[PDB]
Amino acid sequence: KQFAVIGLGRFGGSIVKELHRMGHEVLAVDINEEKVNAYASYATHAVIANATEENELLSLGIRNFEYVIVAIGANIQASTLTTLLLKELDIPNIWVKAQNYYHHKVLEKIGADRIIHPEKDMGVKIAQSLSDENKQFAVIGLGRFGGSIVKELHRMGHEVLAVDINEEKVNAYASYATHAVIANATEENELLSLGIRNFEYVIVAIGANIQASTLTTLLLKELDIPNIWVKAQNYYHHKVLEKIGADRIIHPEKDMGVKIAQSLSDEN
Amino acid sequence: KQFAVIGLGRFGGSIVKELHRMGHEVLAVDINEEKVNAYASYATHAVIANATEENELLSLGIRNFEYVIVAIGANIQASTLTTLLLKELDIPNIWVKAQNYYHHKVLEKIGADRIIHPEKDMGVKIAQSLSDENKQFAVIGLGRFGGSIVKELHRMGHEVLAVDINEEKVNAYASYATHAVIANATEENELLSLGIRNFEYVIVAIGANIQASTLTTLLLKELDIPNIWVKAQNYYHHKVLEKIGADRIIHPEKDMGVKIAQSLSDEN
Amino acid sequence: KQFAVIGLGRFGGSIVKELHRMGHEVLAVDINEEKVNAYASYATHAVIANATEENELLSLGIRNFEYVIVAIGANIQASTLTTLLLKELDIPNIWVKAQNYYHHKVLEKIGADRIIHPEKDMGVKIAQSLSDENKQFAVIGLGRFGGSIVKELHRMGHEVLAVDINEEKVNAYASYATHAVIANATEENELLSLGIRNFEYVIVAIGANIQASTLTTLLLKELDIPNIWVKAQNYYHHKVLEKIGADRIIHPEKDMGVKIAQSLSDEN
Amino acid sequence: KQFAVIGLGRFGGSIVKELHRMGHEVLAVDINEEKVNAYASYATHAVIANATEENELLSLGIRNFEYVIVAIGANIQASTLTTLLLKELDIPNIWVKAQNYYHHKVLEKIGADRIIHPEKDMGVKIAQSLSDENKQFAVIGLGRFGGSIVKELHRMGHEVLAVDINEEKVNAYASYATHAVIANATEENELLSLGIRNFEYVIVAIGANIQASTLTTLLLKELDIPNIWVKAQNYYHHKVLEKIGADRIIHPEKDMGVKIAQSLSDEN
Amino acid sequence: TPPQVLAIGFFLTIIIGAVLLMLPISTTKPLSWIDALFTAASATTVTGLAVVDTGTQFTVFGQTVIMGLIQIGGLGFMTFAVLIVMIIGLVKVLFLFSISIELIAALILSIRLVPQYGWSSGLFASLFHAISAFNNAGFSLWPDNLMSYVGDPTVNLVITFLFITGGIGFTVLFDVMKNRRFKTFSLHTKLMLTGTLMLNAIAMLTVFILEYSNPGTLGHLHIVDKLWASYFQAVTPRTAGFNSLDFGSMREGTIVFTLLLMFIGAGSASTASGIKLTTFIVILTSVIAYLRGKKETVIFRRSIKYPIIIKALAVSVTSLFIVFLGIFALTITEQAPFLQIVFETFSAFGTVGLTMGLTPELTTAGKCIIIVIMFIGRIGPLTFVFSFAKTEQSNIRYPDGEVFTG
Amino acid sequence: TPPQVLAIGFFLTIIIGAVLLMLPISTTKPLSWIDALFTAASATTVTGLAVVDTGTQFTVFGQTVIMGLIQIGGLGFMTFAVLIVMIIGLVKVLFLFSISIELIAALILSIRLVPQYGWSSGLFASLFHAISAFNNAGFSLWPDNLMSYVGDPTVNLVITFLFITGGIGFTVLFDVMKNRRFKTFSLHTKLMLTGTLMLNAIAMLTVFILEYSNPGTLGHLHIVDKLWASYFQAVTPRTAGFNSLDFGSMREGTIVFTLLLMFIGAGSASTASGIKLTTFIVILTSVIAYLRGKKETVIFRRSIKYPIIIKALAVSVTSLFIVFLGIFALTITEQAPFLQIVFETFSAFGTVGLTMGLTPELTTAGKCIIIVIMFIGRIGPLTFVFSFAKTEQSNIRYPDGEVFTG
To answer: Which regions span the lipid bilayer (chains E, F)?
Structure first.
């Protein structure tokens, strides 16, 4: 009934706006005010507070909330110490956004009721969208997202042409894909020689700078790739990719928040 | 009759392929071989040589060429010392690509029969294309190119809303434009507050990184700007700006080489 | 009786060698083998293991050790998750090296029997060495170490001329010192104008690059400063500062480990 | 009789001070005023001017000066165009500071009466000081200075243990030295295994970061190296190396100017 | 240390075993001080040579100790894959699995057609050969050295499966077990299966074409007995050491191909080999890629990284460089034919077992060196040199050095 | 194209020269269709083999065509080397410098102790051998193939200097000229001088220790005549082709070392070789570094870059792989001893010239293949394969492939 989301990052902002969309009370709160300002009309109560101070948690009546969400990115100690305080107020259900693998383990021993990996848990959902959408699968960029789709599609039993810019990731994904390839998706000859033309589903999950993501898809659309699915970064990345011919665009940080905002609504 | 182009950069490559297109003999030559390879069928004779060594200029019969073109970019000494050697072989007409202002002066006292500024001389031609095309003119990015159009459009007597990322350039262009403005073309509010929507002709000459060039035009096209003219950098920058809605794209060195390759053909 | 130190950094290496010096058994262990090799005869048992894996904590008989020391610097999660596992094995006394302030809080709710701030806790010990050594006090560089001495000396009731390169620290230390000054210790005029000649005890706690530390002490020795105390970084820093005329050199982690190695010895 | 030095850099500053020391008229002048201020009492006439403008050369009576010195570093065109103007005023003797090899060539065809390479021409003089000083020679850092001493000492016929941080220089100096070695002078084991102890004369010409210069000498002084000669950068680099135990310190910028200031005096 | 332990340690099982058999209980006729440190060296190196015949000269005590030394040589083989795996818990599996396939394929499948000699010579001769077959020894009981079982279906089918699978590396042994899929085998395991069978086809073809009309061996055999020889003749130079036909009465060309066929070992782990099959493939196919323009050496669309190239080259030249030293130091020691001196050395270093009739007629001076040949070859030319090699670490690079070789 | 032109082009000088000699003017006794395409192939390949004796079977015209054909072959290598150097103006020097040291060291220094036979056979026999010596041919006039000049000082001193320097790279030929300093020689040139002389000392020691008591050749020669043979027999396996003593009456061990001594060519630029000396050094010393620890193969404190390693390995295995094919494809073709079949092949592929007495008794079936051996070995195994090798450029990389070989 009473919902509260801490940390207005990309993930924690996509749950405050979605839970408010259907019509549920959301106690949004972030460490500074720059984000809390733009979310003044996107939540039941917008608050500027630091989730590490005890008196700011009590004065906020946070214990009346059966569902607290910690989406503070960047420094992990802000994410951990928060849930450490929440588990002391006997919060019924605390949901936390973890960063790496060890963050999963430490939060599990604190008492974190739920842990969500926006990049990982999204890849397994996209790897289900590509499976139920139909043969030839190819994922470019073995980031956290691009690695969770190569790992999942291979689990179901589908051919995956995994390929990343360097080999450090392609090495650990040698037994995680049908064909692990070390290539740069911006070079034409590396796209042709890889027989990428034969792949109806290309996934550009390259992270970091946008040009590697875009130029890839730009080349893919030239090879008449039937369905190109791309991992975008910011809003302008969506618009430009939409005008290139990107058949599908996925926001791991945003699209996951709307799914979690559906998991908290149907949970009561 | 006999044409020879030294340095196969973007400029020196656009004159070798153009003069060869009509059907004129071109002795293309550059310091490395990486470029001379791709221009083996784009010239009458592709040669790998350093234009600073005497024996390589003599053994190439360069003296038989009444028109030698020094397009070696990057460091200037390769450009200067070349023409310095060429003016010793009594070359009838030496045409040189200068870089900055002092390059113009030093090459002038060497004996350079002609000097070309690809970024500058192109802006004055575009400032002629925008004038004969029709009222409200605005040029973003006060680079060498974007500065040569604000200077020339204001010269004839047309309103120019000059604007660049930083103020260092906007200062020197205070009396060179109808309105000098310091703004970042990536921020929407700075584009709206500048009344940029009223300008039928927006010029994005922000050089260096491409995202500042692109994102700008992406915003401009959202404001339904009638005619956006953009300065592209590489081949892929041409493709991406084309799918955004760029009403025209200008390659300062490429488009200038074809004009010089027309000045050398009609000169004899 | 049973001593074990995890993480062979500068702090955790100065306790394995000190406890081994007196004649106490030390179970040294670090994440990589690069350090475990050099400490093969500096401890009772040198082991290569990762403190986050359970099976490597059990197979090492770590529970038989009443005193476990977590000195793993750099990432905090390695420091935290370790103590989290240690407290599960009912370790009698766990001593941990915290990094920032929040690290102190989170480690306190896990069950850490003791927390040591090598930079901070050493400043308060030096602030006692300077007090019992005699009038005019001045500390350069408001780092973690240099901030822990301006606050301690001001507590007893001694004049402190605090000064840092920028103002961000000097602002928070305006009421923590007799005089908060914003200055760069490399400029002669800023040293003369601050009346630094009248101070018999100068402390250079500027961390990070060594040249700022050295050059300061170089200038101080020119004004005939009676006693200069410097925070060195590496071994060569100790040597070069020694040939400059540094009256005192302090290694906050090294000198703290030998004190903790004495607190653990006399604790049983 | 009439002397004038253009550009008050490290080189052009060390000539204005030396010529004024013995007692000769010096028309010092630099592009801006920051340098011309400190040299107001260091020259017969301190002037703020740009040597590329004709009217500034005429109004200064520069033609009355038989000896003009262009010491303007950084951009080469400022150096070249200056001498280009001077040769027009029929300046009897123009001496120029060249930067790279092509600068030597282009200035040579302008009419430059003399060209000086401070880093190069100094190494050949040091290579003469080490020869007449006695057997085992070793030069660290194959910069322009450290490369001109390995090239010269090998010319007369003396053993040179050339060694630089990376291989790119040690490759081109394989037949220019008795032993070309690729090593970092900051690692102890690389200094011992190279038998550097057997070398009575070690030269640290590692430019760029001072710490590689210093730390090297710091190590060398530990090996009881009889005579360590070091290339310092700034004034403070002179003081710190002096307290380490550097037997000799050379300023290629400064020390060469006092030699040219002696060449222009004894020339009339 | 890991290298030196296997060098001097494996040397002691030779010496101690050379007195376990020189004892008057295991030797009927006087065993000279020379012919005792050799035959005990050949069983522990699982080589297949012997100055004296093992079945008649040695009693039941002289044959069981040979079996034990063969088991010892198979164990040191099991150590080399434990080295391969890392680059304790397995040690249970490897030896237990040895005596498993060694018993069920001997006292059950090899005792089917050998119970003829009774139970005093049918129970033992069916078990003695599998400890030597599976281990790729070459030590046979009857003096015929399996020559009597030319076209016996049981022998050629049972014993081959012993030194073949026993001859492939532990990896492919262990890999096919838990993997078991036609497409999930790793690079190395997928290599062996292909190269093993494919080469046997080239080998059975070679022996069958050249020894087809040879009236001495295979020439007058029946149509079915002609396959049991060519097949077995072409599967036994894999350091097996069994004779289906005699090698001292064959065309000169066949012996040549065997010198190469016995030179190249079989399997990395193997059971015994001079230069493992994997080494030959890599070296050869890497050159084939040099004639093509491919910058890198890619196989099975899973390109091998550069280190495997130089190590294969080292093991390659070393075996040749040593076998050459043997052919040289034996042509002068003993007045013997040249074709036999070359065959003997390739076999001695390969622990191959096939001998053209020179091993009984080995002199003393040529023995001590030959004992080293089988010693160096079994222990492998790489893990053997690492012992007495003072490892040196260079920290400083040096200028480029141009040099022609074309 | 640069590879193919040298392949099919050098093939024509063989064919055209094979009719320049079978003409009834140059042949006394009938020259069969088989023994004509051979001897003309050996001179152009400067190999040193011949089905028929060159001095008695061929008239003045025959020896002239052989002689001039050898000059063409040495010129072809002279171009072969120059191409290796850079990867027109010199072509004057090299041929002019050829006929210079070929004339001043023949018609002046070789006509000193040969004017005995008159001027019809003393002026010619002193010029014919130097175009063959300096080019490392092995074609001698008198049937004894220089056996008559066992210990004559003029012969062992004049001819050796011809095929040694001619046999070292034109690099070290050209290098010592303008450099001329003891310390300024490049890596490759400094290599040759060391490896050339040093190996000759090992080779004279070998021939002198083994052929010392051998009553056939060298056993009962005088004390001084014993050095003129051990030395010369130690320097003639360098693709020279001259017999100071007969090889068909030597200890079996001596012949063995020669197979290796003749296998390794001498110098890259050189005069003719199966696998140039530089190749052997690199391959071997690169392994010596592996057995220790140096992360790179550094020689003379001027480390060679990685590409030289793979190319040297390629030239290595190719020569062996082909020579083995020859030894195999000849043991069956002709009923000959085994030691001679192996000696012949190593020599045929190295263009070595030393023959144990099998070249006159070569059958027809074994000839057309042997003609290819000298053809392939002379043209070098690398620049010969690049012709009919469709060069294939790989642009995409592949995953790591684990595989062990120890």
So the answer is: 5-25, 32-52, 65-85, 88-108, 122-142, 157-177, 191-211, 247-267, 274-294, 312-332, 338-358, 369-389
Neighbours of B66 (CB within 10 A): 17
Rounded to whole angstroms, how far apart are CA atoms A241 and A230? 8
CA dist., res. A139 & res. A117, Å (int): 19
Show the tokens assigned to B185: 């073309």
Question: Do residues C150 and C177 touch, judged by C-beta distance below 8 A?
Answer: yes
Handedness of CA A26, A31, A33, A34 (dihedral sign): negative
Look at B81 and D52 and tell me if their CB atoms are within 8 Å.
Answer: no
- Whether D and B touch (3+ CB pairs < 8 Å), yes or no: yes
Resolution in A: 5.8
- Interchain proximity F396–A171, CB inside 8 Å: no
Phi-psi region of C64 (alpha: psi -120 to 50; beta: other; left: phi over 0): alpha
Report the run of H or E that residue C48 belongs to, with start and end: strand C45-48
Backbone φ/ψ region at D267: left (φ over 0), alpha (ψ -120 to 50), beta? alpha
Burial class (CB in 10 A: 0-12, 13-18, 19+), C89: middle
Q: Does B106 touch chain D (CB under 8 A)?
A: yes
- Give the per-residue SS3 of F253-291: HHHHHHHHHHHECCCCCCCCCCECHHHHHHHHHHHHHHC
**Sheet containing B137-140: order of strands:** B179-182, B160-164, B137-140, B201-204, B227-231, B248-250
Taking one residue from A and the other from B, the number of pairs with CB-CB distance under 8 angstroms is 22
Pairing of strands B179-182, B26-30: unpaired
SS3 (DSSP) at D163 = strand
Structure tokens at F309: 């390693």
Separation of alpha carbons C169 and C149, rounded Å: 14
Q: Which fold has domain A120-252?
A: Rossmann fold (3.40.50)
Q: In the structure, do chain A and chain D come into contact, i.e. share 3 or more CB pairs under 8 Å?
A: no
Q: Work out whether the CA dihedral B55, B61, B62, B64 comes out positive or negative.
A: positive
Question: Quick one: B265 exposed, middle or buried, by C-beta within 10 A (0-12, 13-18, 19+)?
Answer: middle
Cβ contacts of E153 within 8 Å, gap of 6 or more: E228
Rounded to whole angstroms, how far apart are CA atoms B250 and B233? 9
**Token pair recorded at residue D180:** 């070309």
D73 neighbors D35 (Cβ within 8 angstroms): no
Contact state of F184 with D175 under an 8 Å Cβ cutoff = yes
Which residues pair with residue D180 across a beta bridge?
A: D162
Measured from the Cβ of residue E198, the count of other Cβ atoms closer than 10 Å reads 10
Sorted by where each begins, the domain ranges of chain F are 2-385
Q: List Cβ neighbours of E265 (8 Å cut-off, separation of 6 or more).
A: E238, E239, E272, E273, E274, E275, E276, E277, E279, E350
Domain with CATH 3.40.50.720 in chain A: 3-116, 120-252
Angle at A145 between CA A139 and CA A147, to 5 degrees: 60
- CATH class of segment(s) C3-116: alpha beta
**Long-range pairs for C23-28: beta carbons < 8 A, 24 or more residues apart:** C24/C264, C24/C265, C25/C1, C27/C2, C27/C3, C27/C60, C27/C62, C27/C65, C28/C4
CATH topology of domain B119-252: Rossmann fold (3.40.50)
Note the Cα F242 to chain centre separation in Å: 11
Contact map slice: F 367-406 vs A, CB within 8 A: 395-400
Distance CA B255, CA F284 (A): 59
Q: What is the sign of the dihedral through the CA atoms of D182, D188, D189 and D195?
A: positive
Distance, in Å, from the CA atom of E291 to the CA atom of E293, rounded to the nearest integer, reads 6
Strand C93-97 and strand C114-116: the pairing is parallel
